[PDB]
Homo-oligomer: A and B are copies of this chain.
Amino acid sequence: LGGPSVFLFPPKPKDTLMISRTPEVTCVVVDVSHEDPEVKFNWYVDGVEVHNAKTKPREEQYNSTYRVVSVLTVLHQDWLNGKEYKCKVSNKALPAPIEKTISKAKGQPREPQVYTLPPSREEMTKNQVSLTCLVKGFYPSDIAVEWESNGQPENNYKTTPPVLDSDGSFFLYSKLTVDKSRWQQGNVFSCSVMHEALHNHYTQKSLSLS
């Protein structure tokens, strides 16, 4: 375990779900000496090598080390079907350059079920109230889930990580908190959900009273 290290990270879910966004794979290289501050990357896709790549150096923070990153913008549907993005980092300090491959989690793409749950009476006795959005039944875990009382997004909400269950898929919960008053008045709130198995990789359900 000598020489520098390499870390290949996947694109962002949201970025891979909507074409207006730019999805890219990043290959980071840490521990690059000042003696040989030079690194050559090799990008391969499903075997076939690629050459889109882009890079720039940054040695800093608390090390006499250099940092290297190679951004490889990617075609949406590419990743979405699964593609080996093998990255081969080369530096003398490395006997034989290091290569690491990443890709969409494999399995059978399943579509999420989205249900919104009103705050149970018991809680209404409080100042603020909890609104639940249940997203169960997806594959992969890769997903996006947000709230909006109006076009404007909401701030007071949390989301559990995706949890895998019996069925073999993934589900999670998102809890949005709102001052009872609002909720009471009879406002409107919705949780949007972006998944690869949604009609347009997107859907939203809304919560209200009565």
**Contact surface of A with B, Cβ cutoff 8 Å:** 113, 115-123, 126, 130, 132, 134, 136, 156, 158-161, 163-167, 171-173, 175, 177, 205
Contact = CB atoms under 8 A, between A and B. Distances in A.
Binding site secondary structure of chain A: strand
B132 A117 contact: yes
A117 B133 CA distance: 11
A55 to B, nearest CB: 31
Contacts of A177: 166-167
Contacts of A117: 117-118, 120, 132
B171 A158 contact: yes
Contact of A123 (B115, B132, B161, B167): B115
- Give this chain's copy count: 2
B165 A134 contact: no
Contacts of A205: 122
11 contacts: A113-B126, A115-B119, A115-B120, A116-B122, A117-B117, A132-B173, A134-B175, A160-B161, A171-B175, A173-B173, A173-B175
Nearest to A166: B156
A132 to B, nearest CB: 6
B134 A134 contact: no
A115 B116 CA distance: 15
A140 to B, nearest CB: 17
A173 B131 CA distance: 12
A134 to B, nearest CB: 6
Nearest to A175: B171
A117 B131 CA distance: 10
